[PDB]
Amino acid sequence: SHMCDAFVGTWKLVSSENFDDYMKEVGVGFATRKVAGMAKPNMIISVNGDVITIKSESTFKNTEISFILGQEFDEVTADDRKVKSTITLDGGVLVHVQKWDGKSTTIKRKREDDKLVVECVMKGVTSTRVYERA
Ligand SMILES: Cc1noc(-c2c(NC(=O)[C@@H]3CCCC[C@@H]3C(=O)O)sc3c2CCCC3)n1
């Protein structure tokens, strides 16, 4: 058993709070924000040894990242930012820091009841995205 166990599986977006303002703060343009706003992505999380893979699959875009905890990696985000990402475990929370152009955003993923809750913070702006098992 590992702390990442509770995350593994296929998840589907069930609700989104303040996501348009989060995207604004990150610098996402109008057209991408409207398309993002409709999307109900799936998130597929798997583990093979030390390597964690998170796939995001939506009508617009399929993204995938594979990473080792604490090891920086290159990531192209859904909105096409080219960022330097580091994902660590803080207790049972996966903490994902993306850095680009002197800016930084933090995405936290945690299990709460039967949900996987994703808290996205950019400067003062927080968004919450709630996933359920698909
Ligand atoms: C920022 C941004 N710009 O476009 C996006 C973005 C997504 N964002 C997410 O899915 C959120 C946002 C940050 C981490 C993951 C979280 C998730 O629900 O898995 S999904 C999606 C887009 C752009 C258009 C295509 C579909 N994000």
Which ligand 1 atom sits nearest the alpha carbon of residue 120? 13
Residue in 77, 101, 121, 125 to alter for ligand 1 test, most ligand atoms within 8 A of Cβ? 77
Experimental method: X-ray
Q: Is 130 annotated as a binding residue?
A: yes
Report the nearest atom of ligand 1 relative to the CA of 16: 18
Provide DSSP, the chain: --GGGGG-EEEEEEEEESHHHHHHHHT--HHHHHHHHH---EEEEEEETTEEEEEEE-SS-EEEEEEETT--EEEE-TT--EEEEEEEEETTEEEEEEEETTEEEEEEEEEETTEEEEEEEETTEEEEEEEEE-
Strands 51-57 and 42-48, sheet pairing = antiparallel
CATH number, span 5-133: 2.40.128.20
The domain spans of the chain are 5-133
> Looking only at Cα atoms, what is the longest distance across the chain?
43
Resolution in A: 1.5
Query: Residue 25 phi/psi, 5° resolution?
Result: -65, -40
CB atoms within 10 A of CB 54: 19
129 is in an annotated binding site: yes
- How many other C-beta atoms lie within 10 A of the C-beta of residue 51? 12
Please report where in the chains the tokens 């303002």 appear, as a residue. 21
Q: Which two tokens stand for residue 113?
A: 């009841």
- Please answer whether residues 27 and 101 qualify as being in contact, where contact means their C-beta atoms are separated by less than 8 angstroms: no
